[PDB]
């Protein structure tokens, strides 16, 4: 009921919470940085206005960090296999959804900062689409927190 | 701004009727408006008035 190979799933859930959110945040930072460093050569005044897709990418990695710390502080040697399965699910829920949120933030941020220098009114539309792209990772954060709140609830 | 760099004084030339009134600030004269109201009061307004020549 609480076997020896049970914290393997918890360690993979602690790893995958930060690994895939860092992959998503790294795709978002790379795409948005290629966008910024190609649109702020000619328009350097709106450089610090365009760093918002990179911040939205970094909040995804913060979401992964929080879940990985909370799964890390619930590991144990003699824990249940249910706890390991819930921690694996909570790691994957935030990781493979923050990866998708990072893909969306990178694509929207590149396409928005390459066209926001031409049209100044497109910035409040880019922020609005990136809010919907960052709520995609906030949903995985909520699912991971609700899973990890029940990892040790009625456990023998 | 950040879609254009300026670091040197820029000018806009306007001419308006001398009976005009701004509707962005009703109760003002155009001359009084330029100095006080216009871009946070930081507008420098300069004379540029010229008289009549001879028109064919």
Curated annotation (Swiss-Prot), chain A:
<dbReference type="GO" id="GO:0000220">
    <property type="term" value="C:vacuolar proton-transporting V-type ATPase, V0 domain"/>
</dbReference>
<keyword id="KW-0812">Transmembrane</keyword>
<dbReference type="InterPro" id="IPR002379">
    <property type="entry name" value="ATPase_proteolipid_c-like_dom"/>
</dbReference>
<feature type="transmembrane region" description="Helical">
    <location>
        <begin position="122"/>
        <end position="147"/>
    </location>
</feature>
<dbReference type="InterPro" id="IPR035921">
    <property type="entry name" value="F/V-ATP_Csub_sf"/>
</dbReference>
<comment type="function">
    <text>Proton-conducting pore forming subunit of the V0 complex of vacuolar(H+)-ATPase (V-ATPase), a multisubunit enzyme composed of a peripheral complex (V1) that hydrolyzes ATP and a membrane integral complex (V0) that translocates protons. V-ATPase is responsible for acidifying and maintaining the pH of intracellular compartments.</text>
</comment>
<dbReference type="GO" id="GO:0007033">
    <property type="term" value="P:vacuole organization"/>
</dbReference>
<dbReference type="GO" id="GO:1902600">
    <property type="term" value="P:proton transmembrane transport"/>
</dbReference>
<dbReference type="GO" id="GO:0007035">
    <property type="term" value="P:vacuolar acidification"/>
</dbReference>
<comment type="similarity">
    <text>Belongs to the V-ATPase proteolipid subunit family.</text>
</comment>
<dbReference type="GO" id="GO:0006897">
    <property type="term" value="P:endocytosis"/>
</dbReference>
<dbReference type="GO" id="GO:0048388">
    <property type="term" value="P:endosomal lumen acidification"/>
</dbReference>
<dbReference type="GO" id="GO:0016020">
    <property type="term" value="C:membrane"/>
</dbReference>
<feature type="site" description="Essential for proton translocation">
    <location>
        <position position="134"/>
    </location>
</feature>
<feature type="topological domain" description="Cytoplasmic">
    <location>
        <begin position="29"/>
        <end position="50"/>
    </location>
</feature>
<dbReference type="GO" id="GO:0061795">
    <property type="term" value="P:Golgi lumen acidification"/>
</dbReference>
<dbReference type="GO" id="GO:0000329">
    <property type="term" value="C:fungal-type vacuole membrane"/>
</dbReference>
<dbReference type="GO" id="GO:0016471">
    <property type="term" value="C:vacuolar proton-transporting V-type ATPase complex"/>
</dbReference>
<feature type="topological domain" description="Vacuolar">
    <location>
        <begin position="148"/>
        <end position="156"/>
    </location>
</feature>
<feature type="transmembrane region" description="Helical">
    <location>
        <begin position="6"/>
        <end position="28"/>
    </location>
</feature>
<dbReference type="InterPro" id="IPR011555">
    <property type="entry name" value="ATPase_proteolipid_su_C_euk"/>
</dbReference>
<keyword id="KW-0406">Ion transport</keyword>
UniProtKB/Swiss-Prot annotation, chain B:
<comment type="function">
    <text>Subunit of the V1 complex of vacuolar(H+)-ATPase (V-ATPase), a multisubunit enzyme composed of a peripheral complex (V1) that hydrolyzes ATP and a membrane integral complex (V0) that translocates protons. V-ATPase is responsible for acidifying and maintaining the pH of intracellular compartments. Subunit C is necessary for the assembly of the catalytic sector of the enzyme and is likely to have a specific function in its catalytic activity. Reversibly leaves the enzyme after glucose depletion, causing the catalytic subcomplex V1 to detach from the V0 section.</text>
</comment>
<comment type="subunit">
    <text>V-ATPase is a heteromultimeric enzyme composed of a peripheral catalytic V1 complex (components A to H) attached to an integral membrane V0 proton pore complex (components: a, c, c', c'', d, e, f and VOA1). Interacts directly with VMA4.</text>
</comment>
<comment type="similarity">
    <text>Belongs to the V-ATPase C subunit family.</text>
</comment>
<feature type="modified residue" description="N-acetylalanine">
    <location>
        <position position="2"/>
    </location>
</feature>
<protein>
    <recommendedName>
        <fullName>V-type proton ATPase subunit C</fullName>
    </recommendedName>
</protein>
């Amino acid at each position: 009921l609480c076997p020896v190979y049970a914290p393997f799933f918890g360690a993979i859930g602690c790893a995958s919470a930060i690994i895939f959110t860092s992959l998503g945040a790294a795709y978002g930072t790379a795409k948005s940085g290629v966008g910024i460093c190609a649109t702020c050569v000619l328009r350097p005044d709106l450089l610090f206005k365009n760093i918002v897709p990179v911040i939205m990418a970094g909040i995804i990695a913060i979401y992964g960090l929080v879940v990985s710390v909370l799964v890390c502080y619930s590991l144990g040697q003699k824990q249940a296999l249910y706890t390991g399965f819930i921690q694996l699910g909570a790691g994957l829920s935030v990781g493979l959804s923050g990866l998708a949120a990072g893909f969306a933030i990178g694509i929207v941020g590149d396409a928005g900062v390459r066209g926001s220098s031409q049209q100044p009114r497109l910035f409040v539309g880019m922020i609005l689409i990136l809010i919907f792209a960052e709520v995609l990772g906030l949903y995985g954060l909520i699912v991971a927190l609700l899973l990890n709140s029940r990892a040790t609830q009625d456990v023998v | 701004m950040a879609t254009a760099l300026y670091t040197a004084n820029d000018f806009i030339l306007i001419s308006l009727p001398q009976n005009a009134q701004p509707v962005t600030a009703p109760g003002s004269k155009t001359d009084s408006w330029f100095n006080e109201t216009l871009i946070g009061g930081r507008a420098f307004v300069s004379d540029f008035k010229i008289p009549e020549f001879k028109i064919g």
